[PDB]
Design a protein around this motif. Structure first.
Motif, PDB file in Angstrom:
ATOM      1  N   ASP A  14      36.810  80.992  54.836  1.00 37.85           N
ATOM      2  CA  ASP A  14      37.478  80.341  55.952  1.00 37.85           C
ATOM      3  C   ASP A  14      36.694  80.612  57.246  1.00 37.85           C
ATOM      4  N   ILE A  15      36.312  79.564  57.943  1.00 38.83           N
ATOM      5  CA  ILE A  15      35.746  79.800  59.250  1.00 38.83           C
ATOM      6  C   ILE A  15      36.746  79.599  60.383  1.00 38.83           C
ATOM      7  N   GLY A  16      37.988  79.211  60.059  1.00 38.79           N
ATOM      8  CA  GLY A  16      39.030  78.916  61.058  1.00 38.79           C
ATOM      9  C   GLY A  16      38.632  77.863  62.102  1.00 38.79           C
ATOM     10  N   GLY A  17      38.931  78.164  63.367  1.00 36.17           N
ATOM     11  CA  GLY A  17      38.703  77.228  64.465  1.00 36.17           C
ATOM     12  C   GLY A  17      37.377  77.398  65.202  1.00 36.17           C
ATOM     13  N   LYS A  18      36.479  78.217  64.650  1.00 41.67           N
ATOM     14  CA  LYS A  18      35.213  78.595  65.299  1.00 41.67           C
ATOM     15  C   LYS A  18      34.403  77.397  65.872  1.00 41.67           C
ATOM     16  N   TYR A  19      34.272  76.292  65.118  1.00 39.09           N
ATOM     17  CA  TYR A  19      33.532  75.079  65.552  1.00 39.09           C
ATOM     18  C   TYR A  19      34.398  73.895  66.122  1.00 39.09           C
ATOM     19  N   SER A  20      35.701  74.119  66.200  1.00 39.67           N
ATOM     20  CA  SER A  20      36.653  73.053  66.511  1.00 39.67           C
ATOM     21  C   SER A  20      36.673  72.544  67.959  1.00 39.67           C
ATOM     22  N   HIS A  21      36.125  73.291  68.908  1.00 34.93           N
ATOM     23  CA  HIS A  21      36.152  72.854  70.325  1.00 34.93           C
ATOM     24  C   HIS A  21      34.879  72.141  70.829  1.00 34.93           C
ATOM     25  N   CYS A  95      42.601  76.961  53.934  1.00 33.48           N
ATOM     26  CA  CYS A  95      41.475  77.256  54.798  1.00 33.48           C
ATOM     27  C   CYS A  95      40.688  76.095  55.258  1.00 33.48           C
ATOM     28  N   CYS A  96      39.812  76.396  56.190  1.00 30.11           N
ATOM     29  CA  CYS A  96      38.860  75.472  56.771  1.00 30.11           C
ATOM     30  C   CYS A  96      37.441  75.867  56.291  1.00 30.11           C
ATOM     31  N   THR A 109      35.291  68.068  59.548  1.00 35.15           N
ATOM     32  CA  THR A 109      35.846  69.344  59.219  1.00 35.15           C
ATOM     33  C   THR A 109      36.705  69.243  57.921  1.00 35.15           C
TER      34      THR A 109
END
Ligand SMILES: O=C(Cc1cccs1)Nc1cc(B(O)O)cc(C(=O)O)c1
Ligand SMILES: O=C(Cc1cccs1)Nc1cc(B(O)O)cc(C(=O)O)c1
Length: 186
Positions: A14-21, A95-96, A109
């Motif tokens: 899971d990388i979560g929201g790391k690249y989401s912004h 997860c992402c 994503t």
């Protein structure tokens, strides 16, 4: 259990929201895991013949983020509901995975979701021509055809229909199979 063991494996990647912004054109996909006959399967859609982009081809449910989406996971669930009738109470997002960069300005994503055992697909015919399952283990020993580009051919033993799986869709399927099935007692 089989499902607890899958989720615990998946959470390690899971990388979560790391690249989401980051300031990209944003799309999300749902990689839907279905347990049948003692084994894990992935659910795929065949795209409607009327679409402009890739008519008639195999892909996962998903699409473009819109202003209503709270986050990228919300995009994947909204789109899955509209395409195959999957309701939010029928999916647990686990997860992402690593996002896919395309065409210099677009970021896709992928989210892995565990699907309720009583879900039954209702394809929207304006978007989706067909829905089918592939056992996850297939992706460790696929029937490969070289077009050099590697294409997978899967024949459903229920009806004898052969599907082609390729590109990003094939790549993500193999990734999920490796995460969940590598290094397991028999
Ligand atoms: O591609 C998707 C998401 C799917 C994922 C799986 C099946 S459908 N939407 C789409 C395509 C097209 B097209 O290529 O013509 C036009 C639209 C639209 O907003 O009209 C929307
Ligand atoms: O979603 C896709 C391609 C895929 C990427 C991820 C899975 S499927 N197309 C699309 C186009 C358009 B459009 O014509 O502007 C609107 C949407 C939407 O989801 O609204 C969606």
């Amino acid at each position: 259990s089989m499902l607890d063991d899958a989720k615990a494996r998946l959470r390690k990647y899971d990388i979560g929201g790391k690249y989401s912004h980051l300031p990209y054109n944003k799309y999300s996909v749902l990689l839907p895991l279905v347990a049948k006959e003692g084994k894990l399967h992935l659910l795929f859609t065949v795209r409607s013949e009327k679409l402009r982009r890739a008519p008639g081809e195999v892909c996962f449910p998903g699409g473009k983020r819109d202003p209503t989406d709270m986050d990228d996971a919300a995009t994947a669930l909204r789109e899955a509901q509209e395409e195959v009738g999957l309701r939010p109470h029928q999916v647990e997002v686990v997860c992402c995975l690593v996002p896919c960069l395309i065409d210099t300005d677009t970021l896709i994503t992928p989210f892995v979701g565990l699907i309720d055992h009583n879900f039954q697909a209702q394809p929207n015919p304006a978007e989706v021509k067909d829905v089918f399952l592939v056992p996850l283990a297939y992706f460790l020993h696929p029937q490969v055809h070289d077009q050099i580009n590697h294409i997978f051919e899967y024949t459903n033993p229920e009806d004898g229909v052969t599907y082609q799986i390729k590109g990003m869709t094939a790549n993500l399927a193999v990734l999920v199979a490796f995460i969940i099935l590598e290094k397991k007692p028999t």
